[PDB]
Design a protein around this ligand. Structure first.
Ligand SMILES: CCCCCCCCCCCC(=O)SCCNC(=O)CCNC(=O)[C@H](O)C(C)(C)COP(=O)(O)O
Ligand code: SF4
Ligand code: SF4
Lengths: 208, 88, 115, 112, 379, 176
């Protein structure tokens, strides 16, 4: 491992693995899997019904006390039956650590809102509803936060076109700003940059 | 004339009048015993539209839990008679 | 099986009731919006547009889809109440500035390759 | 006695030993209703018993703060309250039960 | 109790007033939403790098550093020490630019407006340092996921030293005009008080934490580059009001000067990008004389480098607080997902809580002390 | 390590209380601020006399694009399309075909100056130093159309600026 390779820390890896086992032991009803990355990042995959309990545990247990909610986001993977993946990032100041909690959902299944646990989640949850269409139940007020008023569709889905469906301009006949079907003077050039000759054998998949 | 009690006749006249006010119902087909579905050809949206019009003239809020059962003008007039607590 | 988690309605009756309440709210609000935004349309046109937008989704037979649409409609109505939109946002529902696309085969054949 | 603990909204607690002992006793009493085999019960009982044994064996405050490894004893009382609330919520939730259900076939498979 | 819409950085604010007090204050955002996180998915990592300058345009090299750290963590590589020192030196310089901007803009919104020019002279000098190294005054794109793009010009360290030995007087003049002023104190003291527990729960970070008495700093608790090799102090407030945060920002400026001096004194020799031609492009002479170098230059500037699959969350102590990127890579040369966490989002979310029972004129002061730039808020 | 910014307890003796009362009643700090402003009034301003005086720049400056050529007179561009592929904003459009003598040359090279972000990726991805980002920055326009450069305009820019473009390239090419 020459100076061009990122150094590896084993103590943090062992500590994160031990804490993952500890958490999975405490809450066997909700946690479905625990992982520790090669760069010392611990993630926990749980059932959708365990959003409120597990988070509360990680915020209130004397040994976890993950006080801060750093980020909350969603990932769209259309090839999955449960399309959307919700990610919570928690930071514990007392133990100087970070954790990740992952949950799955689809278009029609709602996810219980975690505003009661973390207030910071509030706007984040709205953002998800604005960008992906995931509905959060028992939210103080759920509405669009980023897109234009009356915007149809959720832009951050993988099946949403990059340029959208409508474009704005100004019309003098009606003396106002109007929306028209989108027409581009130059079409967005699509590049097939992905190449054959796989680069990482460590991630090779079985040939089914 | 000043403020006589609401007769079961005047209520019927007012209900029938505001029914004629509807643009989708012609005066030569509806009756007091007519049904909104098959004798006049309306779906639920006109029914709520009709109900809303009645509320405005009458002045009393009608809950949705029991406004779906006002299916013909007969039970409509019975409903305002019961709500206004008027006998004969 | 095919058991799913509800949103607001257990069956189609409750979803229909919520649709009815949303329609009542929109019907009541149309004249206030027309007066306040100083629209060029009449109340009759606004109510007709509300009816058309409601009947556009008349073929939905899933209570979850129906009450999600109800949630979206309630959000849009709330957006309209607080004057969060402007005249342009309200008037985008009518496409007064877009040319009318034809429907028959011959016109579409003449204009271009669009099927 | 120290004043202005330094954290805004956190008040200075006079006689923190009694408050800590009461809170730990209440935490143990609530934990007593959780089933024995639950990992939460044994882990939290061990932690609370260790903290109670350390708080009962030190009359000083600064040395107790150093030993507890939490610092600023008032926030240790705050964390005790948080743990008590979590224990009650957990007794309500009952998360020691088996898994609700397995995820779909390739729910967590990455890439794709 | 009337409702009013302060309409069109640029912001829309719907608030209810009961006389002079503020009852509810709801900020409407989306006026600068361009969809950066979706446009990133259609670009390679190098092509997606410049978006982060546009993210927070008051602190640009910090965003570059955050993205570079995330990509390096995914790639399992590390930059040479000189690149890290340049990153740290530039990061400190950028912090000064951000703090000058925030303090002067807050004062100008209050109504002082003289320190704005006084310190924008120094901001212009800092632009020159940014310009000399990368050819751009503001949108630099200097910091790359392999290190830095180019080495320093031969006369840059001397100029940085000459500039940085006269900045203390500028900070002293700013404090003279603002710190002890009774009007400024009345405008700022005991305004927008936030408790430590509420600040933690509401997701606040940076000065908003440190102003409330919380001893937290990502450069000290979780150093990333050469920070564990530089000594500096972390200002901590005691009341959580606007005045404490202003004092914290001034002290952070002074500590940034300290770190800049340390970085200037302890500059090491060596290369400026990782000696891995499959990640960092080779030199022009090597490209024009060597076959492997030409092939690697071609493939890096046409297709890009493949990042092993995985998801990471990398956070740094940007001048506005904790700035983070959640990057998901599927193994190709284009990121699958790039979520950006900006402290302005959480701060503006907590604005409504922080402006309870305050005058209308206090909302402007609270917004100024939040250090809100809407590029990062809207993304 | 950490510092306290607002942890000073004012003295409560008679002298300090009297000093604070005198400060309140006589406005000493306001006079100090006025004196600071007055002192700043009597020093030289930092304003330069544009356009007769110009702000300093460096050889690395990115400005208006140009297409260079070899000393013999042949254009350096070989239609490798690396600059088009590396452009983050997709502002470069290239079309090419064999020339009359079989040389690999472009038939169309368009840069949309209203789409370009002036990041310099194009000039550093070029293997023959064909496309360069020149040092000119005063090229504002009264209409949108004239900001859509084609091959003729870029070649004219190269022929116009080649002197100082080559000087800057000579000054800076050892850092690349
Ligand atoms: C002034 C500008 C106006 C702008 C207008 C904005 C439009 C807002 C749109 C609100 C959101 C929706 O559409 S909510 C979508 C509504 N959902 C459904 O309709 C599903 C089930 N549909 C049915 O049951 C029948 O079609 C039905 C005829 C509805 C019932 O007839 P009856 O019960 O009688 O039998
Ligand atoms: S400077 Fe950047 S955006 Fe502009 S043409 Fe070159 S590569 Fe494209
Ligand atoms: S990179 Fe240079 S040689 Fe290649 S197409 Fe662009 S300008 Fe021509």
């Amino acid at each position: 491992t020459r100076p061009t390779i990122r150094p590896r820390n084993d103590v943090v890896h062992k500590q994160l693995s031990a804490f993952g086992q500890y958490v999975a032991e405490i809450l066997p009803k909700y946690v479905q899997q625990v992982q520790v990355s090669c760069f010392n990042e611990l993630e926990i995959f749980i059932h959708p019904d365990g959003v409120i309990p597990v988070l509360t545990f990680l915020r209130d247990h004397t040994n976890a006390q993950f006080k801060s909610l750093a980020d909350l986001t969603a990932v769209d993977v259309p090839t999955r039956q449960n399309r959307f993946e919700i990610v919570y990032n928690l930071l514990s100041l007392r133990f100087n650590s970070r954790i990740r909690v992952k949950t799955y959902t689809d278009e029609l299944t709602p996810i219980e809102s975690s505003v009661t646990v973390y207030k910071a989640a509030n706007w984040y949850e709205r953002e998800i509803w604005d960008m992906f269409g995931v509905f959060f139940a028992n939210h103080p007020d759920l509405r669009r936060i980023l897109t234009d008023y009356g915007f149809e569709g959720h832009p951050f889905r993988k099946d949403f076109p990059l340029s959208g469906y409508v474009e704005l301009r100004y019309d003098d006949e009606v003396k106002r700003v109007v929306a028209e079907p989108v027409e581009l003077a130059q079409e967005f050039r699509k590049f097939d940059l992905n190449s054959p000759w796989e680069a990482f054998p460590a991630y090779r998949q079985p040939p089914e | 004339s000043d403020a006589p009690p609401l007769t079961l006749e005047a209520i019927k006249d007012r209900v029938l009048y505001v029914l004629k006010l509807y643009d989708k119902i012609d005066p030569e087909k509806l009756s007091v015993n007519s049904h909104f579905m098959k004798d006049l050809g309306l779906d639920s949206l006109d029914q709520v539209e009709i109900i809303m019009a009645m509320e405005d003239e009458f002045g009393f809020e009608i809950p949705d839990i029991d406004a779906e059962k006002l299916m013909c003008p007969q039970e409509i007039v019975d409903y305002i008679a019961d709500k206004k607590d008027v006998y004969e | 099986g095919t058991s799913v988690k509800p949103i607001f309605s257990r069956d189609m009756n409750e979803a229909k009731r919520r649709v009815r309440e949303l329609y009542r709210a929109w019907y009541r609000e149309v004249p206030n919006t027309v007066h306040l935004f100083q629209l060029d349309i009449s109340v009759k046109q606004g109510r007709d547009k509300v009816r058309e937008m409601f009947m556009k989704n008349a073929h939905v037979t899933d209570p979850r889809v129906v009450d999600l649409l109800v949630i979206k409609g309630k959000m849009e109505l709330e957006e309209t109440i607080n004057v969060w939109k402007q005249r342009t946002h309200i008037m985008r529902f009518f496409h007064e500035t877009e040319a009318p696309r034809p429907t028959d085969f011959l016109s579409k054949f003449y204009v271009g390759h669009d099927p | 006695l120290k004043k202005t603990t330094g954290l805004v909204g956190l008040a200075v607690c006079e006689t923190p030993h009694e408050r800590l002992k009461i809170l730990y006793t209440k935490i143990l009493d609530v934990l007593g209703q959780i089933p024995k085999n639950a990992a939460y019960r044994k882990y939290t009982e061990q932690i609370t018993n260790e903290k109670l044994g350390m708080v009962k064996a030190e009359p000083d405050v600064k040395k107790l703060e150093e030993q507890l490894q939490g610092g600023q004893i008032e926030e240790v009382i705050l964390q005790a309250e948080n743990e008590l609330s979590l224990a009650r919520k957990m007794l309500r939730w009952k998360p020691w039960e088996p898994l609700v259900e397995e995820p779909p076939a390739n729910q967590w498979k990455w890439p794709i | 109790n009337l409702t009013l819409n302060f309409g069109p950085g640029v912001l829309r604010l719907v608030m209810e007033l009961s006389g002079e007090m503020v009852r509810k204050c709801d900020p409407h955002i989306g006026l600068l939403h361009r969809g950066t996180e979706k446009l990133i998915e259609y670009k390679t990592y190098l092509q997606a790098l410049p978006y982060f300058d546009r993210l927070d345009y008051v602190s640009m090299m910090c965003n570059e550093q955050a993205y570079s750290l995330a990509v390096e963590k995914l790639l399992n590589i590390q930059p040479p020490p000189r690149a890290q020192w340049i990153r740290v030196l530039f990061g400190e310089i950028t912090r000064l630019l951000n703090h000058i901007m925030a303090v002067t803009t807050h004062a100008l919104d209050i109504g002082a407006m003289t320190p704005f020019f006084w310190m924008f002279e120094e901001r212009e000098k800092m632009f020159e340092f940014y310009e000399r190294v990368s050819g751009a005054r503001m949108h630099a794109a200097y910091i790359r996921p392999g290190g830095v793009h180019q080495d320093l010009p031969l006369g840059l360290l001397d100029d940085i030293y000459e500039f940085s030995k006269n900045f203390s007087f500028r900070i002293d003049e700013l404090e003279e005009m603002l710190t002890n002023n009774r009007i400024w104190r009345n405008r700022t003291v005991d305004i927008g008080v936030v408790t430590a527990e509420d600040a933690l729960n509401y997701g606040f970070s940076g000065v908003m934490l440190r102003g409330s008495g919380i001893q937290w700093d990502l450069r000290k608790t979780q150093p990333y580059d050469v920070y564990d090799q530089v000594e500096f102090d972390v200002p901590i407030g005691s009341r959580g009001d606007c005045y404490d945060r202003y004092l914290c920002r001034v002290e952070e400026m002074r500590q940034s000067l300290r770190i800049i001096s340390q970085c200037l004194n302890k500059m090491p020799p060596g290369e400026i990008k990782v000696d891995d031609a499959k990640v960092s492009p080779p030199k022009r002479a090597e490209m024009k004389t060597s076959m492997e170098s030409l092939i690697h230059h071609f493939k890096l500037y046409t297709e890009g480098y493949q990042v092993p699959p995985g998801a990471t969350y990398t956070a740094i102590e940007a001048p506005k607080g904790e700035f983070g990127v959640y990057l998901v890579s599927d193994g190709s040369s284009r990121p699958y997902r790039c979520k950006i966490k900006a402290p302005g989002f959480a701060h503006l979310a907590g604005l409504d809580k922080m402006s309870k029972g305050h005058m209308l004129a206090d909302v402007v002061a609270i917004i100024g002390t939040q250090d809100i730039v809407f590029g990062e808020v809207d993304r | 390590t950490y510092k306290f910014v607002n942890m000073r307890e004012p003295s409560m003796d008679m002298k300090s209380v009297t000093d604070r009362a005198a400060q309140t009643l006589l406005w000493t700090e306001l006079v100090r601020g006025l004196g600071m402003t007055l002192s700043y009034l009597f020093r030289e301003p930092a304003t330069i006399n544009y356009p007769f005086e110009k702000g300093p720049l460096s050889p690395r400056f990115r400005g208006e694009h140009a297409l260079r050529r070899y000393p013999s007179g042949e254009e350096r561009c070989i239609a490798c399309k690396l600059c088009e592929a590396v452009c983050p904003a997709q502002a470069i459009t290239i079309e090419a075909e064999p020339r009359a003598d079989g040389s690999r040359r472009t038939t169309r090279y368009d840069i949309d100056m209203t789409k370009c972000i002036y990041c310099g990726f194009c000039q550093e991805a070029c293997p023959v130093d064909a496309i360069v980002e020149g040092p000119n920055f005063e090229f504002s326009t009264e209409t949108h159309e004239e900001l859509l450069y084609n091959k003729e305009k870029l070649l004219n820019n190269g022929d116009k600026w080649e002197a100082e473009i080559a000087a800057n390239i000579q000054a800076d090419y050892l850092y690349r």
